[PDB]
């Protein structure tokens, strides 16, 4: 808990009693920080049948939703079944880590 990354890792890992609401609020903050052009660039570094391309595209779709409306996207994420939400968070965190390391 405390800090976007701490909250999201904790939610995925089922520690620190993170509520669904808190995780989705932190996700919105992370998506705001991510740049979809950066991710499209990472995506295009991949070979044509890399499984990563599909993943990159889902995270691009989250960023685009969040950009149009933060609060609506928080509500949307909160409606995903918890297992679906955690995979969403993991893929987004993974892309955040890649960009951070290579900056």
Numbering used by the authors: 1 to 103
Question: Which sentences did the original study use to describe this structure?
Answer:
The M2–1 transcription antiterminator factor is a basic protein of 194 amino acids that exists as a stable tetramer in solution and is essential for the complete sequential transcription of mRNAs in HRSV. Given the relevance and uniqueness of this viral transcription antiterminator, we set out to investigate its RNA-binding domain (residues 73–194) using X-ray crystallography and folding thermodynamics.
The HRSV M2–1 RBD crystallized with two molecules in the asymmetric unit. The structures from both crystal forms are virtually identical in the core region (residues 58–177), with a root-mean-square deviation (r.m.s.d. on Cα atoms) of 0.3 Å. The elution profile from size-exclusion chromatography indicates that the HRSV M2–1 RBD exists as a monomer in solution. The RNA-binding core domain appears to be a compact and cooperative folding unit in the crystal structure reported here and the previous NMR structure of a similar fragment.
